[PDB]
Amino acid sequence: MPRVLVTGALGQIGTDLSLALRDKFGADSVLVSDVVEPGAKHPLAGLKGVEKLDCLDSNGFEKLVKEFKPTWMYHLPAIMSVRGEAEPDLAMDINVNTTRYALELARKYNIRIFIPSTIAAFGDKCGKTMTKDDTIMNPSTVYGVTKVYTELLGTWYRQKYGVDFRSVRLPGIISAATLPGGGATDYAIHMYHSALLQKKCVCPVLPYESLPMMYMPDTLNSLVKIMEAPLEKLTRTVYNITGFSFSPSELRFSIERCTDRTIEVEYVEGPAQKIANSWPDSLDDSNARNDWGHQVKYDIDMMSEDMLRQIPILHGLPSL
Amino acid sequence: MPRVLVTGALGQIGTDLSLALRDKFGADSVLVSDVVEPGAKHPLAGLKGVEKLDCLDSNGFEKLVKEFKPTWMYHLPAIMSVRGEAEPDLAMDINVNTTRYALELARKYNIRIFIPSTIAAFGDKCGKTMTKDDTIMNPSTVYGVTKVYTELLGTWYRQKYGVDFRSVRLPGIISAATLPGGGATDYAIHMYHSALLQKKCVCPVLPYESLPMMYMPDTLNSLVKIMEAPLEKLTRTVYNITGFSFSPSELRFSIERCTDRTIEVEYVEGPAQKIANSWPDSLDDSNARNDWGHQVKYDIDMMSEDMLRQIPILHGLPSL
Ligand SMILES: NC(=O)c1ccc[n+]([C@@H]2O[C@H](COP(=O)([O-])OP(=O)(O)OC[C@H]3O[C@@H](n4cnc5c(N)ncnc54)[C@H](O)[C@@H]3O)[C@@H](O)[C@H]2O)c1
Ligand SMILES: NC(=O)c1ccc[n+]([C@@H]2O[C@H](COP(=O)([O-])OP(=O)(O)OC[C@H]3O[C@@H](n4cnc5c(N)ncnc54)[C@H](O)[C@@H]3O)[C@@H](O)[C@H]2O)c1
């Protein structure tokens, strides 16, 4: 049974991943950390093994690793696509420097290390229909740039020092628990909240812009699964994974089918649209499926039913 | 007429580029900077317009730019392939951080900025014959990883802010002006010296490993030409350029054909071997030819004749 460190743990992915790890391996085997402390209403508030650590503080990062002696690490902090275009110096600092520290710690302390990539590592030359694992990578966002740097550096660590670096290119992730941190796919979660609150939703992505997406329970399954795989079954360090693709107009229809209630949606093209337009419409994830058994249970309507149930319970929005 | 700033200017490229720029534009038009001073025998020793600057010092780099007001910048400092693998923290510091500051300055002060990339930005999935401008980039060295980041970040600056960022992927560059160090293609400059000295050459590169390469006067021509082009002529930010390809054993036959003597080469194992083996055999530079008139005069024998004439004149080794 592994000892697992999650850094950047209080955000969208980290909140549910931390709970799932704890459930599967037991709380004593999981330590999580974030630059901020949890609010009283955060799901990880009041739990043991939840620490304050700025990953840019490389001494504090080493101390924590040396004390806990993880065998696995999920290194999650990054400034994402939309927010990075508005805060590019913070993105370059966090996404490049915390990654370099994390990899050197994986090398020095023998850790299997996962650092997520993203569909934002692609740009407009990738071949946007059923995008392959190996293709031209020309990101149009600083976030995307720093994620291609992530993939390549991690792979270099694997080749040069035998560091067990693993990654997936995550699609937009949908969940109910913790609000998203500023990607171009944040509209999808907000659309649900707009429908439940009966407020107008202003969508900055255009109505027919299809993107690869996935619901959180499939994501968690894959994040765990890729880490448990024997190193011999892996043919590459970085895998595309997807759940299913959708556009905003498709998601809106899914939500109105479940609520029996028109959502009001004004498309008013923001930063997210130009960014999303440079990304894949869909991904080919045959390598992940073949090598380590990436699998998806949820479709768009299963997800929307679950989302529409969870959000009122978790956030006290109105129900139905 | 431009006001040109060259950073990392005392090296192999910088030394001869700085001379060519001062000839073409006038010494008062050109400012050369480096983190070291020129040695007593350096071609730039004693001249005006030679400043000392550590480009890792963001504030001092901004001061120099404020004071001189360049319209063009050639940003040249980097840790290259063999030294990068031995000192990767230095490479990641220099190659990423100085590049970020350079681009920021080009943004803030309206500078046309050239930062070279390299054939080391490619790895074994590039398509090693006549490698294309847009292909899979999977570099096998930390240097190479940092240069993909350089290309992508530079390009983002161009897209996001309209910075007039220009780059070529330089092949192995051969010149007489500087003494052969321990770099990966530095074997070729070593062989010339051994031929003149009638010593044996110790070559870590496999005998038949073809690499793209170029002789300096062609390099100088293209480095100036790409910066003179109107922006409207450029269809891209990063171009392949090559001179011609050769292997160590081709270089030896060339040197033999010129000197009418047998020269001695011992092929050994060394870090350069595996690095070189991961790089392209030849490059397609048709974009660079068509857009801005990249042109190559020299072939191997013309270079060998010249090198065998120049090294004795500049370094005072035995001639003929
Ligand atoms: N959510 C998505 O749809 C999506 C898609 C693709 C890739 N990803 C990647 O997954 C990762 C996690 O994303 P997420 O959505 O949970 O993001 P998030 O923004 O919701 O969470 C980021 C967490 O990192 C923490 N953090 C920020 N800077 C830190 C620092 N210096 N030190 C320590 N912690 C720091 C933040 O406080 C936050 O709790 C990132 O690498 C992101 O690129 C997410
Ligand atoms: N020479 C080649 O065959 C070749 C091939 C491909 C690409 N390039 C690229 O050309 C550029 C220069 O290559 P070169 O061969 O002249 O290198 P070089 O190593 O001969 O010279 C580099 C110079 O940079 C200086 N420098 C190092 N750190 C610095 C700092 N912090 N601040 C300011 N200056 C610093 C060094 O003192 C040295 O004078 C690099 O970007 C290299 O990647 C070179």
Side-chain angles (χ1 to χ4, degrees), chain B residues 196-317:
Chain B
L196 293 166
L197 281 177
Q198 300 158 251
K199 296 302 111 203
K200 79 176 180 204
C201 174
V202 182
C203 178
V205 169
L206 289 171
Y208 303 108
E209 186 78 61
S210 294
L211 286 175
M213 303 270 218
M214 203 186 302
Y215 191 39
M216 185 61 87
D218 296 314
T219 309
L220 298 177
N221 197 63
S222 289
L223 287 182
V224 178
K225 199 167 307 206
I226 191 177
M227 289 290 272
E228 292 179 313
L231 184 50
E232 314 93 68
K233 290 308 182 267
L234 276 33
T235 64
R236 44 185 303 120
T237 54
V238 188
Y239 292 87
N240 293 342
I241 65 177
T242 195
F244 46 93
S245 292
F246 61 87
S247 63
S249 74
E250 295 170 334
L251 181 65
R252 177 186 195 171
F253 281 112
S254 179
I255 291 171
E256 280 171 9
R257 275 190 304 260
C258 295
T259 63
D260 189 50
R261 253 134 58 192
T262 293
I263 92 141
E264 316 218 302
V265 189
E266 188 189 12
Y267 292 104
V268 297
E269 22 193 322
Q273 196 173 96
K274 257 286 182 333
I275 297 167
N277 192 68
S278 71
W279 293 351
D281 287 350
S282 56
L283 310 176
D284 189 339
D285 65 2
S286 66
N287 293 325
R289 295 178 194 267
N290 293 347
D291 284 8
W292 54 263
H294 169 64
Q295 68 172 64
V296 176
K297 178 57 168 203
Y298 282 77
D299 64 24
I300 190 160
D301 290 347
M302 211 187 115
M303 174 180 77
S304 294
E305 193 250 20
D306 199 62
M307 274 295 286
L308 292 159
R309 301 183 178 192
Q310 285 301 146
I311 275 141
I313 299 180
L314 306 159
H315 304 285
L317 292 192

Side-chain angles (χ1 to χ4, degrees), chain A residues 11-306:
Chain A
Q12 189 195 350
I13 296 173
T15 297
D16 287 308
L17 178 72
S18 304
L19 299 166
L21 287 169
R22 276 167 74 103
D23 281 347
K24 190 195 171 78
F25 304 125
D28 283 328
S29 286
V30 188
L31 184 67
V32 313
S33 71
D34 199 287
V35 69
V36 307
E37 314 201 308
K41 294 182 150 76
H42 198 282
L44 302 187
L47 303 187
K48 81 180 315 190
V50 170
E51 305 297 334
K52 177 147 183 255
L53 162 69
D54 188 336
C55 282
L56 284 178
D57 162 14
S58 61
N59 279 161
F61 194 177
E62 183 161 14
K63 192 178 100 92
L64 195 70
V65 167
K66 179 160 21 66
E67 283 157 24
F68 175 62
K69 314 154 179 284
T71 64
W72 292 11
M73 168 177 10
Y74 289 86
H75 177 69
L76 313 181
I79 306 296
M80 295 186 288
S81 54
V82 174
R83 163 132 93 124
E85 292 302 273
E87 302 179 61
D89 298 287
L90 188 64
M92 285 185 277
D93 291 347
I94 301 306
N95 301 5
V96 175
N97 300 326
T98 72
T99 290
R100 162 176 186 174
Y101 305 155
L103 288 162
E104 164 56 18
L105 291 167
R107 181 206 72 72
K108 184 164 175 182
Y109 299 89
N110 197 27
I111 314 172
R112 179 182 298 163
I113 179 173
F114 179 88
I115 319 181
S117 195
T118 173
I119 57 166
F122 298 119
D124 69 4
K125 293 181 182 192
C126 66
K128 290 168 183 168
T129 306
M130 289 304 286
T131 309
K132 293 167 178 150
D133 276 315
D134 294 327
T135 189
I136 301 156
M137 298 300 279
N138 71 313
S140 74
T141 67
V142 68
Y143 166 63
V145 175
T146 65
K147 294 294 194 176
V148 167
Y149 185 73
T150 300
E151 290 184 16
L152 294 173
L153 193 68
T155 305
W156 175 79
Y157 271 86
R158 164 69 184 86
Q159 293 179 352
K160 172 73 180 175
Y161 301 114
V163 176
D164 193 350
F165 166 76
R166 306 181 183 199
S167 186
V168 309
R169 311 198 176 88
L170 291 177
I173 306 300
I174 309 293
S175 57
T178 287
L179 292 173
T185 63
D186 294 25
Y187 84 88
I189 293 169
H190 288 273
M191 201 183 276
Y192 290 109
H193 288 250
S194 291
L196 285 173
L197 288 157
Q198 295 175 228
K199 320 259 90 195
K200 192 163 70 145
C201 174
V202 186
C203 195
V205 177
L206 287 170
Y208 322 121
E209 189 72 53
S210 168
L211 284 179
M213 300 266 191
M214 194 182 299
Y215 193 42
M216 183 62 78
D218 291 319
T219 310
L220 295 181
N221 190 63
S222 287
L223 292 176
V224 178
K225 205 160 180 178
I226 197 173
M227 287 291 272
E228 291 183 310
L231 178 59
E232 287 180 335
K233 296 312 169 284
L234 302 190
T235 66
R236 43 187 307 110
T237 53
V238 186
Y239 297 78
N240 290 343
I241 67 179
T242 190
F244 42 94
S245 299
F246 63 80
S247 69
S249 72
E250 294 173 331
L251 178 60
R252 182 184 191 178
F253 281 135
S254 194
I255 295 177
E256 293 171 354
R257 269 182 284 190
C258 300
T259 63
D260 218 322
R261 196 157 81 209
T262 295
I263 317 177
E264 210 199 347
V265 184
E266 187 184 56
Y267 294 95
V268 193
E269 204 205 299
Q273 168 52 31
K274 296 282 149 298
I275 290 160
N277 192 61
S278 76
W279 295 348
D281 288 339
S282 54
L283 306 183
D284 190 328
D285 59 1
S286 68
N287 288 328
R289 288 183 196 276
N290 291 336
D291 286 1
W292 51 260
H294 173 62
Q295 59 185 56
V296 182
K297 195 208 153 205
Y298 285 78
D299 62 29
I300 198 180
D301 293 327
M302 293 171 57
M303 174 178 74
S304 301
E305 192 193 52
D306 196 68

